[model samples]
Target: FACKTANGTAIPIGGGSANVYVNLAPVVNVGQNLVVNLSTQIFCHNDYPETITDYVTLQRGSAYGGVLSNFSGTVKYSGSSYPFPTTSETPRVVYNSRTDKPWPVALYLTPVSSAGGVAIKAGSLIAVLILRQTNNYNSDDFQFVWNIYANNDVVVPT
Candidate 1:
């Protein structure tokens, strides 16, 4: 069940293009469950320029959403590049239904700045699901959450 976003944007994967903009719908339901697997690669055009690192974060709620989790040290954007600003790195993320709780379900991507700052990628994907266990479900019952799968390619430039 793969769905591409309508306002879809593209990040260079390894840093060639800018970060991707992702504002997607919910991907899961509270008390409900699902598994998610995420992977990302970053390409840089410069080799030996500097060390590059990626980070992922999950945010819950709407535009006024809050932080959920920062899966750091999971993915990395490093190594040498043949061409300047054309090198690349790839990382993977996995979400298990049993371990992960379904409280926050929104997902976002970002790249950690060299200055230890965060550059938010504009777009993201949300895990959407229906909760059939409880008959008491409403829009308010649907809380949103965000996850940063690959941050190296998702951060906004600072």
Candidate 2:
């Protein structure tokens, strides 16, 4: 799998047998926003080539002792954007179907101190992206774990 940053640079992500992981180098701050672009190529067996309805969900995992309450974000897919929830109940992409092609998902996020009086904290965070698919002979699920770090430094204008 390949992953890109907000600056449009492509980098390789670690993966094997349907599980992938990406470690971002950016030090996320309380006031700074972060954007991540993820891309992957998919293909089924030539004999089993068929369209399947797939879904992707992003969920919050271990916080490494930091707070993540007011964190809000959106995920972009197939020319449309949807709210990126921190729970596994709501999928970011629903009824997404594909056969064999390039898949891209972009994430735009902001970590604020408060949203509607709810407090949000900053710390090392983990994002677990679950991808699921079911077809006639293909039933598969892939998980991608993203480890992100939070910094305490205040953003200074350059």
Candidate 3:
């Protein structure tokens, strides 16, 4: 699903396929917190299929020129809670129902900065989401650069 405003207006971030790419619209207000909800099905070899639900909150901290931070969120496989790593490079593992197998999924969020380390401005800024899934060798991977802005008057995608 796409991000929504406080008013419940749908801000469409382009769709994705298997190895998807997302294009987040540019036009959010400064200080506005955008909540992103993602749900997907993950099939692990011969094991039973599982559903994954996750969310990440991106907060616009500056007007015109600001930084985006991961406010707070959760990741769950079926109904069990999964932990977020202290380091972005580490992948967190979720066990199957039998608890005999491990599925590793890594999620990372980074603020896009311009030259001189200046955060993106109100007009447009880019944020990156990286997902890595591995059993022993890295199997599934998804990454996207989101172009976001700080203007609420922008059009919502249908």
Per-model tally of clashing residue pairs? 47, 0, 5
lDDT, candidate 3, equals 0.28
lDDT of 1 by residue, 8-88 (tens): 332222211122233322332222222222222111121111332222222111221111221111211122112111123
TM-scores, all models, native as reference: 0.18, 0.43, 0.27
- Quote model 2's TM-score: 0.43
Ranking by TM-score: 2, 3, 1
Question: Which model, 1 or 3, shows the larger lDDT?
Answer: 3
Per-model CA lDDT versus the true structure: 0.22, 0.40, 0.28
Name the TM-score of candidate 3.
Answer: 0.27
Q: In model 2, how large is the Cα lDDT of residue 44?
A: 21
* TM-score of model number 1: 0.18
Please, what are the lDDT tens digits per residue for candidate 2 over residues 1-158? 22333334333323222323333324455455555455543222112324544444443333322233544576655555666653333343443333333344555566665533222223434343433332343445444444443433213222
By the TM-score metric, which is better: model 1 or model 2?
Answer: 2
lDDT of 1 at 46: 16
